[PDB]
């Protein structure tokens, strides 16, 4: 139905800013919100039909040590969204404690926008894992949202903290945030910063402005994932239907990101299907096997093309299977958006549940285990000591992520009547 998007932290407000600018350029609206003459669509998914003839998005603006949020303030896209709810770092414990002491009025801000829309489908959190500003406050707000409203969906667009990096408390912060992500979320969309960094340094020759270009990538992915909700189809006009097939069980709810053009700066469905199935057109970079894949395509699609393409995908076997059942790559067709640039006219994206993300999890667990065994990299942060003098939450998070790795490896098995 209707989605209320939450943005917090400098990185989260950055990706929310670029996503809102992307949807402003995509739909027929000005940066003030002035209606265009070209706009089967919907403008009520992220947008309220708001009360000065601007389709003002329902966005929660949160700031914590604002630097780039000031630049968001003096901007032409501050006439698109500002319901005036801006209310005030480098650690998970600091952001968690600061979010703890002021949960009341920001929950009232959440309540205001929850009363704002007529219907609700989910809460999409613009979040950065171990980003400092987003960290801690994001995990605490995740606890507040999932506890306060058990009837709705929680989505968290997340990065994986590896940017070729100094912060040595970052494995502890990412471990605690990942504990919150596994326990207090219905679905998590995870990307790798190093993968998008490699793709960006590949397609161009940029080295310094990597942040802004990564923002372009995640905003394009976020628009592409909700195109089937924003444009009326037949299925996944609600979030829970797209969330349902990829997630077989409440512990494996972490989804890989794919999108078959890495380019927007002739083509058929058959070629982009075989181009999608390689792990180097995946923007997230023993037996490793997908649980379930779902692909959504948008373009000038001949309906016979998806049919024989799926034929070729079967008898080639270029996708990793699921042992305990059928749960396979599903072909979904969506409408080509108005006022999008005419490159890669047939363009598809995929969301997939893969066991290969367990490797990235255990790598970060190994980094945490190294710094935890050495006992020289807690740095004695005062909020970390005052929050937990015994630091048993790190042990609990380690246990939870170990159970997560075991359940991943158990889902890898042909028997998943053996658990972890």
């Amino acid at each position: 139905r209707e989605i209320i998007t939450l943005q917090l932290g400098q990185c989260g407000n950055q990706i929310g800013f670029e996503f809102w600018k992307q949807l402003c350029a995509e739909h027929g609206i000005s940066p003030e919100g002035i209606v265009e003459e070209f706009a089967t669509d919907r403008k009520d998914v992220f947008f309220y039909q708001a009360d000065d003839e601007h389709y003002i998005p329902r966005a929660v603006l949160l700031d914590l040590e604002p630097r780039v949020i000031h630049s968001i303030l003096n901007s032409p896209y501050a006439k698109l969204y500002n319901p005036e709810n801006i209310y005030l770092g480098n650690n998970w414990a600091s952001g968690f404690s600061q979010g703890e002491k002021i949960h009341e009025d920001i929950f009232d801000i959440i309540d205001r926008e929850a009363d704002g829309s007529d219907s609700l489908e989910g809460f999409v959190l613009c979040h950065s894992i171990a980003g400092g500003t987003g960290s801690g406050l994001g995990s605490y707000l995740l606890e507040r949202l999932n506890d306060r409203y058990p009837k709705k969906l929680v989505q968290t667009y997340s990065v994986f903290p590896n940017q070729d990096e100094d912060v040595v408390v970052q494995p502890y912060n990412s471990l605690l945030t990942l504990k919150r992500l596994t326990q207090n979320a219905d679905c998590v969309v995870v990307l790798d910063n190093t993968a998008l960094n490699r793709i960006a340094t590949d397609r161009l020759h940029i080295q310094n402005p990597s942040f802004s270009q990564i923002n372009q990538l995640v905003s394009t992915i976020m628009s592409a994932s909700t195109t089937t909700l924003r444009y009326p189809g037949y299925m996944n006009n609600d979030l829970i239907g797209l969330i349902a097939s990829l997630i077989p069980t409440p512990r494996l709810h972490f989804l890989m990101t794919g999108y078959t053009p890495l380019t927007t700066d002739k083509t058929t469905v058959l070629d982009v299907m075989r181009r999608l199935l390689q792990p180097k057109n995946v923007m997230v970079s023993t037996n490793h096997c997908y649980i379930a894949i779902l692909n959504i395509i948008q373009g000038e699609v001949d309906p016979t093309q998806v049919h024989k393409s799926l034929q070729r995908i079967r008898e080639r076997k270029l996708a990793n299977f699921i042992p305990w059942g059928p749960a396979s790559i599903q072909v979904a067709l969506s409408r080509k958006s108005p006022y999008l640039p005419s490159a890669h006219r047939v363009s598809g994206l995929m969301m997939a549940n893969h066991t290969s993300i367990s490797s990235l999890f255990e790598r970060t667990c190994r980094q945490y285990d190294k710094l935890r065994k050495r006992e020289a990299f807690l740095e004695q942060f005062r909020k970390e000591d005052m929050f937990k003098d015994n630091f048993d939450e790190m042990d609990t998070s380690r246990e939870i992520v170990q159970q997560l790795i075991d359940e991943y490896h158990a889902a890898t098995r042909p028997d998943y009547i053996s658990w972890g």
Binding site: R1, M235, R314, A327
Partner: protein, 377 residues
């Protein structure tokens, strides 16, 4: 050329839209049925558009031509067919112009797809959500107005506000020969398009609407139980596995239906925009209906006798699980094991049946046997 006759208890091999038909017996054996149908088409068409418009006036020229045929003996089919088809072409272009233009057919096809065939996902999903208790309750006369005004409120709720051809839509909960069982949708038809939409085509549309709405209804509530429990035992995690497991094959069923709707509707619309013949539009509707009736597989009883069960098992599971979020050792396990085994049975049976051989049916198998758990069956 008028639709008037002067017979006194006799026949001239013909028996608005009143007492017009041809019988094979009274028609002579050396005149074929082919030219006779063209004659009958001319008479019926001219009779239809002549009144209530208060039309063509080439009647005298055509009559002089026929009269010239009467003067010159005797019978030879080639002259007769030439003059009858010369009337037929002008009549057909006239009749086509009237029906397609004075009332638009294109908007009708758009509305019929948008509602009978579930072309508005958000409207129909909000309608399922809002009118839940209304459609759940057993049939009575006065619930039909409630579900109609809720269905109109959702149309305004998505922010597509439009008067005219939305009030022509109704939800008909009949009574005296759960409210979902007697649920229907209806649509009104104008006078030029009146002959095109006869009770049969809309009768089939209603059944398609019921099938698609049943699976769309099943999907959301299975998922609500699943997400409710996900947000929170061995019994617990088994149910979420099972929720997903049923949702899969059910979603694939609805997707095969999505495939046939796109592929056949493109042909229908494209044929309508590219023709100036009245008969070809009738034939386009014929092809559309026959293909759709085949692809639902309602013609064959066993696969139908299985898809009913696919909806049924999810209904029972959703009602049982929602009572207690905590574990059910109150004969929850007894139904849970039967549910997963019977889902295996029914999904395997429909998989076997889906295994002439239309293409779309054929590669619908080729999703799940990518990932090989019906390669083991």
């Amino acid at each position: 050329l008028h639709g008037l006759l002067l017979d006194q208890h006799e026949e001239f091999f013909i028996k608005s839209l009143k007492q017009f038909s041809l019988r094979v017996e009274i028609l002579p054996s050396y005149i074929p049925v082919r030219v006779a149908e063209k004659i009958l088409f001319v008479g019926e068409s001219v009779q239809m558009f002549e009144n209530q418009n208060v039309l063509k006036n080439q009647e005298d020229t055509f009559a002089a031509e026929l009269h010239r045929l009467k003067q010159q003996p005797l019978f030879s089919l080639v002259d007769f067919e030439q003059v009858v088809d010369r009337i037929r072409s002008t009549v057909a272009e006239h009749l086509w112009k009237l029906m397609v233009e004075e009332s638009d057919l294109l908007g009708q096809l758009k509305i019929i797809k948008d509602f009978y065939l579930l072309g508005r996902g958000e409207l129909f999903q909000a309608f399922i959500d809002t009118a839940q208790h209304m459609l759940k309750t057993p049939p009575t006369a006065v619930t039909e107005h409630d579900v109609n005004v809720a269905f109109q409120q959702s149309a305004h709720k998505v922010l597509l506000d439009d008067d005219n051809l939305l009030p022509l839509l109704h939800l008909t909960i009949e009574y005296h020969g759960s409210g979902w069982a007697a649920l229907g949708l209806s649509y009104k038809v104008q006078w030029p398009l009146h002959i095109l939409f006869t009770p049969a085509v809309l009768e089939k549309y209603n059944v398609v609407f019921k099938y698609l709405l049943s699976v769309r209804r099943v999907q959301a509530e299975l998922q609500h139980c699943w997400a409710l429990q996900m947000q929170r035992q061995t019994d617990a995690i088994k149910w979420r596995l099972r929720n997903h497991m049923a949702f899969l094959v059910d979603n694939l069923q609805y997707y095969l239906q999505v495939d046939v709707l796109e592929s056949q509707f493109s042909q229908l619309l494209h044929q309508i925009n590219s023709t100036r013949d009245f008969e070809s539009i009738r034939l386009a509707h014929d092809h559309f209906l026959s293909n759709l009736l085949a692809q639902s597989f309602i013609l064959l009883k066993p696969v139908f006798h299985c898809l009913n069960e696919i909806l049924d098992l999810c209904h029972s599971f959703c009602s049982l699980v929602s009572q207690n979020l905590g574990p059910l050792d109150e004969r929850g396990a007894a139904q849970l094991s039967i549910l997963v085994k019977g889902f295996s049975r029914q999904s395997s049976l429909l998989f076997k049946i889906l295994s002439h051989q239309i293409n779309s049916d054929l590669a619908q198998l080729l999703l799940r046997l990518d990932y090989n758990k019906y390669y083991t069956q």
